[PDB]
Amino acid sequence: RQCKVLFEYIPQNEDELELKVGDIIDINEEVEEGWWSGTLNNKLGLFPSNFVKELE
């Protein structure tokens, strides 16, 4: 499962991914409602799911 970042995200905690519009994240799992782990540029971290759109 993959998603595309729709909006920039500047991390608030060191375990969160920095997101730029157009990044493609490989989705891992839900940590809590609204926050998922995924991988981006060989880094695993958390990201807010309302920032992305799930791809086909």
Binding site: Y9, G34, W35
Partner: peptide, 13 residues
């Protein structure tokens, strides 16, 4: 409008 990140409570287990 840009989105607001949800609150966090948990680290990855």
């Amino acid at each position: 409008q840009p989105p607001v990140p949800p609150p966090r409570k948990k680290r990855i287990s």
